[PDB]
Amino acid sequence: QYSPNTQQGRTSIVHLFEWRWVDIALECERYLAPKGFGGVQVSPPNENVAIYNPFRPWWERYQPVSYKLCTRSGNEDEFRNMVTRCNNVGVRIYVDAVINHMCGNAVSAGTSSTCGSYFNPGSRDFPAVPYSGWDFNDGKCKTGSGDIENYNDATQVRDCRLTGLLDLALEKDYVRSKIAEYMNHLIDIGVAGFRLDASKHMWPGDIKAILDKLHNLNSNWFPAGSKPFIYQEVIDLGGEPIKSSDYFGNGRVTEFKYGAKLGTVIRKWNGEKMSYLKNWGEGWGFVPSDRALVFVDNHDNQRGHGAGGASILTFWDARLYKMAVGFMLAHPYGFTRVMSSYRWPRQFQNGNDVNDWVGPPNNNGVIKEVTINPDTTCGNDWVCEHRWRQIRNMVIFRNVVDGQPFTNWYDNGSNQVAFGRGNRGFIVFNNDDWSFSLTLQTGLPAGTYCDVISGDKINGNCTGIKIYVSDDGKAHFSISNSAEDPFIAIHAESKL
Ligand SMILES: OC[C@]1(F)O[C@H](F)[C@H](O)[C@@H](O)[C@@H]1O
Ligand SMILES: OC[C@]1(F)O[C@H](F)[C@H](O)[C@@H](O)[C@@H]1O
Ligand SMILES: OC[C@]1(F)O[C@H](F)[C@H](O)[C@@H](O)[C@@H]1O
Ligand SMILES: *[C@@H]1O[C@@](F)(CO)[C@@H](O)[C@H](O)[C@H]1O
Ligand SMILES: [Ca+2]
Ligand SMILES: [Cl-]
């Protein structure tokens, strides 16, 4: 469960948040495969509640109605087409599995679902699965409200309703089997792994019992014995009885401390400095690298809906964001996930975004297709951070330096640092309020390298900054604090 199952050489996954299956399929062939992306995390593919108040919020997809592959992203045919086309070009698909709960207990009964399936939260009836009152934790939960009230009580966190979401009785074989049926359906279609949503709200043992029922990956694409990649969504920032390490026996875990701390460092909050990143990784109290799924921001916390808090960097903070993502992609710690979002009318009131519920770009509820601009950017309000030169080129940087050790670290005791990856790559950052100009040891072979942040390597030439490495591996770097991107990155595949 710990291996991503990506093609050899591809080291990252991208979250194509709320994208339609047909658009992801095309993206796999026209950009992800050629650019070396390892895979795609897709939004929940199972039928969810259609919420009209507010109008089709993104979070409606985290309120299951059934396991039918029928959503605003598409139907089963479209989903299968996407998984097949992506796998055929060496790009994997990871499913956001919402298996801890069904929809909110107060949601109105009826057919307001993405596939028209009938459901009655009040009577705990979900005939399309089917689930009944016997399949929920109503009688197991000991809180007065029936919802989670205290995170200091590890039991209620798992047996009670997360903000009212009907909590499935994961200890029952029937429920475990229905969930396994859904996940095996996806694995047989070709999915390479899963993000287990709300894993903190599930007992480690229950998750294991479910994972024990899963199939090996489809043998038409994967070698015999391949196990689905499992990364559990556990928000553990410390100070709680439940720890992310409690889930290591099931697969990897999302390390939310990563983006929270990186954000505070790059923002220079509380006096934090980039020079402190020298021992980045386990030294900062993070989970072991081989159990970490890292990211700068996710679909939740990029809109103040998750951990990390206000320190989280997002596309809204483009300049600092690119630097944070660049550092993450260059550093060897963990398995990296890049975020791809959509723009929404952010409206802050008293420090809170009143429009943080807004769903994907749409026309009368129908998700807009992803249009590509002549400059390779996206239209229809899709941000497509993964297409930003500074991010895409760093995704490739990580591939090129895969396996190389963290070395040749340098820092000015403030916010100017640099480091290399063996003899395959080198990166320099200037996050201080003054310019940077110094000759550093890159550990790279002599030659002329193209900076992949300010430009690209095209036909034996660089479109941006050029770096000259001497016979001793030394090279001069100049970065103004006024530069569009205050960091430079060069690697073996950017050499002239
Ligand atoms: O270890 C068993 C388990 F995984 O975790 C706890 F012991 C729960 O009480 C139990 O219902 C669940 O199946
Ligand atoms: O993740 C499951 C677990 F928490 O850790 C290991 F997987 C153990 O083998 C299992 O029995 C235990 O319930
Ligand atoms: O903000 C995160 C969230 F939306 O609410 C709580 F933090 C849950 O523990 C987490 O699993 C869920 O994703
Ligand atoms: C997990 O599923 C939920 F329903 C619970 O948090 C959503 O609200 C979250 O955004 C998703 O990560
Ligand atoms: Ca639960
Ligand atoms: Cl996540």
Establish whether residue 235 lines the binding site of ligand 3, counting it when its CB lies within 6 angstroms of any ligand atom.
yes
Ligand 3, atom 3, lies closest to the CA of 306
Same domain, 333 and 479: no
Mark whether 373 and 412 lie in a shared domain: no
Is the domain of 150 the same as that of 169? yes
Same domain, 366 and 233: yes
Residue 121 neighbours by CB under 8 Å, 6+ apart: 102, 103, 104, 105, 106, 107, 108, 109, 166
Domain identity same for 164 and 275:
yes
Method: X-ray
How many C-beta atoms surround the C-beta of residue 289 within 10 A? Answer: 16
> What's the total number of domains in the chain?
2
d(CA 356, CA 347): 8
User: Residues near ligand 1 with C-beta < 6 Å?
Assistant: 171, 203, 205-206
Cα separation, 443 vs 134, whole angstroms: 63
Cis status of the peptide bond prior to 130, with omega within 30 of 0: yes
In terms of domains, do 119 and 242 share one? yes
Q: How many angstroms separate the CA atoms of 123 and 133, rounded? A: 7
Non-local (6+) Cβ contacts of 115 within 8 A are 47, 65, 66, 68, 70, 71, 128
Q: Check which CATH number belongs to the domain holding 373 and give it.
A: 3.20.20.80
Residue pair 293/234 in contact by the 8 Å Cβ criterion: no
Which atom of ligand 2 is nearest to 246's Cα? 4
Phi, psi of 135 (to 5 degrees): -100, 10
Residue nearest to atom 5 of ligand 4 (CA): 198
Does residue 426 sit in the same domain as residue 377? no
Q: Residue 236 annotated as binding?
A: no
Angle between helices 173-189 and 76-88 (to 10 degrees): 50
Structure's resolution in angstroms? 1.4
Which atom of ligand 4 sits closest to the CA of residue 163?
5
Residue 77 near residue 20 (C-beta atoms within 8 A): no
Mutating to test ligand 4, I would choose from 41, 62, 165, 302 the residue with most ligand atoms within 8 A of its C-beta, which is 62
The four Cα atoms 214, 294, 56, 149 give a dihedral, to 10 degrees, of: 80
Q: 391 and 411 in one domain?
A: no
Instruction: Report the separation in Å between the CA atom of 198 and the middle of ligand 3, taken as the mean of its atom positions.
Output: 6
337 among annotated binding-site residues = yes
- Tokens 């941006």, located at residue: 464
Residue 12 sits in the same domain as residue 113: yes
Q: Of the candidates 403, 434, 469, which is a domain's last residue?
A: 403
- Cis ω before 405 (30° cut-off from 0): no
**340 and 205 housed in the same domain:** yes
Same domain, 126 and 228: yes
Contact yes or no for 289/283 (Cβ under 8 A): no
- Domain end residue (candidates: 403, 420, 445): 403
State in Å: Cα 199 to ligand 2 middle: 14
Which residues are catalytic, by number? 197, 233
Residue 32 DSSP code: I
User: Closest ligand 3 atom, CA of 100?
Assistant: 11
Q: Which residue has the tokens 């997002």?
A: 314
Residue with tokens 């009580």: 153
Domain containing residue 279: 2-403
Our answer on whether the CB atom of 485 is closer than 6 Å to any ligand 4 atom is no
Same domain, 410 and 278: no
Residue 427 sits in a domain whose CATH number is 2.60.40.1180
Whole-angstrom Cα distance, residue 365 to residue 295? 29
DSSP assignment of 71-138: BTTB-HHHHHHHHHHHHHTT-EEEEEE--SEEEETTSPPBS-BTT---BBGGGTBBTTTTB-GGGBST
**Residue where a domain terminates, one of 355, 382, 403:** 403
Is residue 331 within 8 Å of 279, Cβ to Cβ? Answer: no
